[PDB]
């Protein structure tokens, strides 16, 4: 029993990451294949940031300015193209701890795994959700760009995110791996806010029934609701409006524990207009909404990798 | 910037976990050199969980009872002891994916990452500290056994922890690899209750000058206090004592920030008195205390491995 915010585990990622080197910037960058990604600001200095036209700043750039290394030994450059807001290196090594992976680009609401690296290594790994405003909440100090996101299926790992940008809010923006930037966000350096941190609702509600299956229930009432009502209640909140589909996706767990689904929507309403008066649901103070459903079904039931 | 729970990378320790099989109970072993270490109630059916005579049971078993598997290649047992509550199978092959590693004994307060797992293959990634009563708040499910604790210090793991079983109020507890429990615990099926869950005070204080370094500060106020007094507060709220020895590892947080360390315990012991007011800190709407000040100097200045 017990739940936690659980990453996968980083090992076939560990085993991508490399450092990148153009002039004076340091950054991180993934080695799969033999193509290496990472930032394309890596060619900008602090100062182009304000106002960088890529396309010309690239023209000054030849393949032996990227300087790339893996671990303790250099990687040779044998080309190098831009696509979006990523640099894709052609090395001439293919990298031999290559990992089965897929490039995907995730739906806000879905979690993922970060391994924060600096300088080509790993710090540390923790857990993230792309948020409905298509910021991340991480931890990424300087140096820490070229990061990545991912999940693991089996052993598969697809890869959804490269951290890219930290905004003046302390809340972090990145791309997918074809280099597209999640939501509005640019690599500049420059006023863009982030809009509304709405609250994902499909997943405090898999949280709640990850509390009910570990022992955590004084949270159960005896209320129903509809999901109209409910959502009546959930945009005072500020949290997603709940879809069908949530619902559908929501029904391994409503049967797992015999809660139908509209019936914890009561008890998540309850919550909301009432507050937590000072108790906890699995160690929090807070309804917690990183946990996607299938991350629930996932840890309760012991999936490996 | 930003503060997240983060666990170590796991990369070092996926490549050190084997399945061990043991008449019907599979669970998992550690694999460093050529000694395969386990739970010795591997050996052990449900039913002899309740009252088991390890040493008795252990004169049924020979080395090719203990079934110990890498991934789909099996490895051979060419001797077995029982070490306190943990087995060493010695293997005919050294690992060759062994890092660099120590056996350490923590002391309650210190953090460790834990990689979850059944079957022999890693699940998942999360921190974990030792709790005062020497328990731990973990994920575990049947089969996890085996499962280890760890820190990495650049290149060297040191293990601290190996899952051995859940209390009947769904908290966990274990061993060194020594074999030896932390805490009163036994490896056996009986009544054992955890003591007081009380909260690491020094860690909680850590935890707040993370906040002051990542932008959350409404918790600062104009006051001061002293260790007497401020414990006085402690013992009320079931925190920890403060020590001397407590302020003086808090010192360099205390001059990055330039708060005084009796300062931070004023704003502590306001945040006790008065509560948060529905205010969060650090995305956390609960004091956390599963940060050790040197977690806290680490993931603020991006030190990696
Ligand atoms: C001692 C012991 C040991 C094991 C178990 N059982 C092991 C399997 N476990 C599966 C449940 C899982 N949790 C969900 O929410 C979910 C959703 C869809 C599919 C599957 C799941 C339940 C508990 C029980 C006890 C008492
Ligand atoms: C854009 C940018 C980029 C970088 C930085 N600085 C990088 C280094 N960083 C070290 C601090 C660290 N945090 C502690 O709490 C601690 C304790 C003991 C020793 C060291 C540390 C501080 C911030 C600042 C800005 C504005
Ligand atoms: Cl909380």
């Known amino acids: 029993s017990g739940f936690r915010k659980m990453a996968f585990p980083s090992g076939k990622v560990e085993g991508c990451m490399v450092q990148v080197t153009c002039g004076t910037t340091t950054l991180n960058g993934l080695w799969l294949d033999d193509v290496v990604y990472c930032p394309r600001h890596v060619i900008c200095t602090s100062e182009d940031m304000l106002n960088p036209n890529y396309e010309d700043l690239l023209i000054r750039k030849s393949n032996h300015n990227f300087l790339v290394q893996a671990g303790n030994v250099q990687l040779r450059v044998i080309g190098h193209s831009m696509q979006n ?34 300088n080509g290594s790993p710090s540390g790994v923790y857990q993230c959700a792309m948020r409905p405003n298509f910021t991340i909440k991480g931890s990424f100090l300087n140096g820490s760009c070229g990061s990545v996101g991912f999940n693991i299926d089996y052993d598969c790992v697809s890869f959804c995110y490269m951290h890219h940008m930290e905004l003046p809010t302390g809340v972090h923006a990145g791309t997918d791996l074809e280099g597209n930037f999640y939501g ?22 898999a949280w709640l029934y990850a509390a009910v299956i570990n022992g955590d229930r004084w949270f159960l009432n005896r209320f129903t609701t509809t999901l109209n009502d409910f959502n009546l209640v959930a945009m005072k909140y500020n949290y997603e409006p709940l879809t069908q589909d949530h619902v559908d996706i929501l029904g391994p767990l409503s049967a797992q524990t015999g809660i139908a689904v509209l019936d914890m ?3 998540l309403k309850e919550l909301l207009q009432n507050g937590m008066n000072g108790r906890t649901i699995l ?23």
């Open 283 to 305: 160690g929090s103070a807070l309804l917690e909404d990183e946990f996607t459903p299938f991350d629930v079904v996932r840890q309760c039931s012991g999936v490996t990798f």
């Open 85 to 118: 807001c990523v640099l894709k290196l052609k090395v001439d090594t293919a990298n031999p701890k290559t990992p089965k992976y897929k490039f995907v680009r995730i739906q806000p609401g879905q979690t993922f795994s970060v391994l924060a690296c600096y």
């Open 265 to 267: 929507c009561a008890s």
């Open 184 to 205: 509005p966000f640019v690599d500049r350096q420059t006023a863009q806010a982030a809009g509304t941190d709405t609250t994902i609702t499909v997943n405090v509600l």
